[PDB]
Design a binder for this molecule. Structure first.
Ligand SMILES: *[C@@H]1O[C@H](CO)[C@@H](O[C@@H]2O[C@H](CO)[C@@H](O[C@@H]3O[C@H](CO)[C@@H](O)[C@H](O)[C@@H]3O)[C@H](O)[C@H]2NC(C)=O)[C@H](O)[C@H]1NC(C)=O
Ligand SMILES: *[C@@H]1O[C@H](CO)[C@@H](O)[C@H](O)[C@H]1NC(C)=O
Lengths: 25, 49
């Protein structure tokens, strides 16, 4: 499903902290 | 015609606050190493407290 997150991610080009919200549709 | 009563409606309650885990934690935090989290996007059922 659609996944939503709000972290301070280190992934400057692709993934393949501070996560104050998460959701899945 | 006067309004005979007042009706109030909202969506069903869902997604209660993590207080239910916090105040049932046998591992409850030592004051020299106190710990926390943001309770957000939740039903804060403070009436139960
Ligand atoms: C921490 O966990 C406890 C245990 O689940 C939560 O409080 C207690 O929750 C139970 C339901 O799981 C309540 O029991 C029910 O009460 C009604 C009304 O008297 C009765 O008709 C049912 O047969 C059943 O016994 C219980 O009243 C409730 N309170 C206490 C003091 O045991 C508690 O809510 C959790 N902590 C937080 C902050 O949510
Ligand atoms: C985000 O993370 C940094 C480093 O861990 C921390 O200083 C800051 O207070 C955090 N802020 C939030 C809103 O989580």
């Amino acid at each position: 499903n659609v996944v939503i997150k709000v972290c301070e991610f280190q992934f400057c080009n692709d993934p393949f902290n501070n996560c104050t919200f998460e959701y899945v549709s | 015609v006067q309004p005979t009563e007042s009706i109030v409606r909202f969506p069903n309650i869902t997604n209660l606050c993590p207080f239910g885990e916090v105040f049932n934690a046998t591992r409850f935090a030592s004051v020299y190493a106190w710990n926390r989290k943001r309770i957000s996007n939740c039903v804060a059922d403070y009436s139960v407290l």
